[PDB]
């Protein structure tokens with residue numbers, strides 16, 4: 001399980017900015033499990 | 045080849061850098077996280093002027 005991430009500073013209001021920003025890998029986990037469905041998590 | 049200090053930049057935990065001919069050009073030392081560029085030691089033809 002590989003995770004890629006990059007945190008870029010944008011001042012746009014509501015749209016994905018036009019530009020290029022590659023995402024360096026963050027962490028790899030050799031879990032070897034089955035993932036077919038997923039859900040996010042939010043705070044209140 | 046020969047090992048030398050490298051002015052290259054890597055990822056936080058990147059490993060090495062390959063080149064066009066599928067030959068490794070640089071390598072990161074496994075013991076201490078230091079990057080070395082691999083340059084093959086000198087070679088070439090020999091011509092005898094006589």
Ligand SMILES: *[C@@H]1O[C@H](CO)[C@@H](O)[C@H](O)[C@H]1NC(C)=O
Pocket residue numbers: 075076
């Ligand atoms: C392995 O070597 C590095 C540097 O040579 C050292 O910092 C590290 O502690 C060593 N590993 C262990 C388990 O001692």
